[PDB]
Structure 1
Amino acid sequence: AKTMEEASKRSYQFWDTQPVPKLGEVVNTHGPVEPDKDNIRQEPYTLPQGFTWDALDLGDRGVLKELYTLLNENYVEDDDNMFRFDYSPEFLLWALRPPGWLPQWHCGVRVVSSRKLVGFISAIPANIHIYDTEKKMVEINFLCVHKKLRSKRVAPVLIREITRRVHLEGIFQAVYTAGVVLPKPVGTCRYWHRSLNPRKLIEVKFSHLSRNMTMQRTMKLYRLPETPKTAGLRPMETKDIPVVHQLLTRYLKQFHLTPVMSQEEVEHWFYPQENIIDTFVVENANGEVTDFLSFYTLPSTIMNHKSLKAAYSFYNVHTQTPLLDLMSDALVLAKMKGFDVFNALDLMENKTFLEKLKFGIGDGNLQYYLYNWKCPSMGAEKVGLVLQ
């Protein structure tokens, strides 16, 4: 299902057995769908014959490359099946080894006879704020089955097995996103795209000519200053970690689904690493950081035939610089860094700048979910959580 009426007509054999609300039910309650089980299965779940569990050591360069290759060739595509994500090995270490990562949560599936990696799912620890509750959860990401093993019910085994391994660590709630509709979305978001290199975006058919426009007029439409306007703007440095933590923590209080990051987590997620994560702060006249913007790097391979370099807005905190100016500088910085497109969701306060800043709304939805938690749904503007 891609919309909820698609999901209105479908049977959920696996998800009906899971502690998540039914799609049809209207939810007002707050808390777990079920009580925690205090004795947990020690044995890993049975895979189909010919397949075996292997926890992937991503500190081993060969195993990280095995994982990269699986995701490069089998992970999320667009709705039109024209572009596939091209996660780099250094991005995967960033996304998969934040503070608190556990090796048993890098859960791969291999072919027994050849040891070929054919499946994967991951959990990372995350302190999550949902409405008035702050709880330790896991973020689930990179669920992936090889194309040659699709529609053999392997995905429910991966979900059950990462659940069991998370339960063993005493965690009973999880958060995750998906482009398909399942029981049951807590929030719904849409991707918006801001062209920065419109010629390239049209040759690879990511974008197309508006009616009677011309490349020369479209390039004119999306032109940017190429030197940012805000004074005091500069890359984040080690000395900025405490204030960036401070700024983010207070900014996120206005949203209903937010992460709660320690100072070490703020360092991991925001300290710049070239081709992975970019963060820029705005220092004022008296030397105090008052704003910062962030976006991460995720290229997309062109499926028909190298890649489209895409920036994704991460967390943007404004206390003195107007958010529109802050995001305008982010577009400039992305274009100086060679990015062809700048993506962002309609969550947090992004709606206040998306149209003004020439973003075009894209196709497909991004659903947010909680596992084993009852809460009312919320609008995109209330979601304050971005996952990689």
Structure 2
Amino acid sequence: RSYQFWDTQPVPKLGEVVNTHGPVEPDKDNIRQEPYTLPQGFTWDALDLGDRGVLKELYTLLNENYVEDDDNMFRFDYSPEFLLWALRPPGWLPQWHCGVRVVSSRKLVGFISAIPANIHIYDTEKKMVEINFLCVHKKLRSKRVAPVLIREITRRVHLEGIFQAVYTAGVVLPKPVGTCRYWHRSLNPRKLIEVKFSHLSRNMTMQRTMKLYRLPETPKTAGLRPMETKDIPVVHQLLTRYLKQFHLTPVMSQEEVEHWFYPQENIIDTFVVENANGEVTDFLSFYTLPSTIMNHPTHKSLKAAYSFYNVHTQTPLLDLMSDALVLAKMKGFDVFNALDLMENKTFLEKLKFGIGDGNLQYYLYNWKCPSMGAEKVGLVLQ
């Protein structure tokens, strides 16, 4: 195969085994000062997401044009407040919220974003960025706009002295460092079958299916409660120690832990286990991301929870995740999603998760290293 754009980039070749660890090319000593040229009629615009009007414009772009399933039945519906959470973590930069507008109408038609992240990859910690929310309006697809967005964000990141990035995609590109699979745990099977997210199993009736997926009304783990301000330091401690066992992980400051885990209704939930001694020994977390159900007369949205980071030191992981499912059901979610990364394969089948269609590929930009199994991936992106 051939990749017109990706073959020009500092990434390894598909199907070539890597034995070394390091950058594909050295750091650049001079960087292009001018933005890359867009097709006539379009212009760059940095989006100030602290402006209500601009945030809503981005919401609308993504709501109408972002990731869909293969059958064009579901589309991610990131809320404006979720977008602020995902795009303004500690160290965020305005120039890294990179929009494309039509010059005449001002209509937002493209976006790409970078946020800073310290990333541990095997035996090296690098300052990187995480690239997310790459989106081109449906009416502009297949016109090679994506490569311009990627090159422009690369340039803007280079200006800040950063030369590596991490990103995920549902498509195969040169060259995945890890390959994960989505799994889904039905919470509201009647709705999920009705909207054709799932189907009735061959030998199962609806009644049997509702029975199969039924959950306790309240969590069972002793001392489980929502994370509070006082828990920030211990959650940071727990996470840092837990992540050591994997080969691709974030390295979060205490300020970053506060940002990513402190509960915000309809965005991020974190529950800690505070034991009989008053010690926090475990935590679970999941984020809120609904999908629009396209072309349906009565069901308009699928409420999905996504497993984030789950740390166990005294509570079995199986128990923690059982409680995450119950909590998600209580909060009105239709489905609970998780990847087969970290120690997740240890609970997925047992807790009645079903395997999904889509893969999620993990990539590094300008870093060559051996690929890893899903269980060694310890990084979750929004």
Question: How would you bin the TM-score normalised by the shorter chain?
Answer: over 0.9
Aligned to 1:358: 352
How much does 1:198 deviate?
Answer: 0.6
Cross-structure match for 1:6: none
Quick one: distance in 1 between partners of 2:73 and 2:138?
Answer: 16
The Cα of 1:142 is off from its aligned counterpart by: 0.2
CA distance, structure 2, for counterparts of residue 212 and residue 72 of structure 1: 37
Structure 2 CA distance for aligned equivalents of residues 269 and 323 of structure 1: 21
Task: Give the CA deviation at 1:214.
Answer: 1.3
The question of whether the paired residues in 1 share the 8 Å contact of 2:170 and 2:360 is answered with yes
Deviation, structure 1 residue 364: 1.4
Displacement of 1:24? 2.7
Moved more, 76-85 or 246-255: 76-85
* Count of aligned residue pairs for this structure pair: 379
Q: Give 3-state SS (helix, strand or coil) of 1:234's partner.
A: strand
What per-residue deviation string (whole Å, max 9, x for no partner) do you get for residues 292-351 of structure 1?
000000000001272000000000000000000000000000000000100000000000
Cα separation, 1, equivalents of 2:16 and 2:381 = 27
**Structure 1 unaligned regions, length at least 5:** 1-9
**In the alignment, what sits opposite 1:5?**
none
Select between 131-140 and 25-34 the one with higher mean Cα deviation: 25-34
Indicate whether 1:312 and 2:306 are aligned: yes
Give the conservation status (yes or no) of the 8 Å contact 2:63–2:77. yes
Query: How big is the shift at 1:261?
Result: 0.2
**Alpha-carbon distance in structure 2 between the residues aligned to 1:299 and 1:128:** 28
Deviation, structure 1 residue 262: 0.2
Structure 1 residue ranges, 4+ long, deviating more than 2 angstroms after superposition: none
1:197-224 Cα distance to aligned partner (Å, 9 max, x none): 1111111111111113111110000010
CA distance in 1, matches of 2:347, 2:16: 34
- Aligned-partner Cα distance in 2 for 1:167–1:234: 43
- Looking at structure 1, the residues matched to 222 and 53 of structure 2 have their Cα atoms a distance apart, in angstroms, of 45
Q: Percent identity?
A: 100
> Per-residue displacement from partner, 1:138-192 (whole Å, max 9, x unpaired)?
0000000000000100000000000000000000000000000000000000000
What residue is the counterpart of 2:289 in the other structure? 298
Q: What residue is the counterpart of 1:272 in the other structure?
A: 263
1:65 CA displacement: 0.4
Aligned-partner Cα distance in 1 for 2:67–2:216: 34
CA contact (8 A) 2:116 2:130 kept: yes
Tell me the alpha carbon deviations over residues 334-388 of structure 1, each in whole angstroms, 9 at most, x when there is no partner: 0000001000000000000000000000001000000000100000000000000
The structural deviation recorded for 1:79 is: 1.5
User: Residues 225 and 273 of structure 2 are in contact (CA less than 8 Å); yes or no, is this contact kept in structure 1?
Assistant: yes
1:371 aligns with 2:365: yes
Alignment partners' CA distance in 2, 1:81 and 1:320: 43
Following superposition, the deviation at residue 11 of structure 1 comes to 1.5
CA shift for structure 1 position 52: 0.4
Q: How far off its partner does 1:80 sit?
A: 1.6
- 2:294·2:300 contact (CA, 8 Å) conserved in 1? no
- The CA distance in 2 between the partners of 1:50 and 1:352, in whole Å, is 52
**In 2: Cα distance, 1:212 partner to 1:345 partner:** 27
User: Which secondary structure does the structure 1 equivalent of 2:283 belong to?
Assistant: strand
Corresponding position of 1:328: 322
Q: CA deviation at 1:117?
A: 0.3
Which deviates more, 210-219 or 34-43?
A: 210-219
What is the distance in 2 between the residues matched to 1:342 and 1:71? Answer: 22
Which residue of 2 is the match for residue 173 of structure 1?
Answer: 164
Q: Deviations over 1:265-292 (max 9, x none)?
A: 0000000000000000000111010000
* TM-score in terms of structure 1 length: 0.97
Q: Distance in 2 between matches of 1:178 and 1:226?
A: 36
CA distance in 2, matches of 1:145, 1:46: 16
Q: Which of residues 186, 193, 218 in structure 2 aligns to 1:195?
A: 186
- What SS class does the counterpart of residue 203 from structure 2 fall into? coil
Matched residue of 1:318: which SS?
coil
Q: Report deviation, 1:128.
A: 0.1
Distance 1:377 1:218 in 2: 38
Whole-angstrom distance in 1 between the partners of 2:107 and 2:6: 28
| Corresponding residue SS for 1:331 | helix
TM-score by length of 2: 0.99
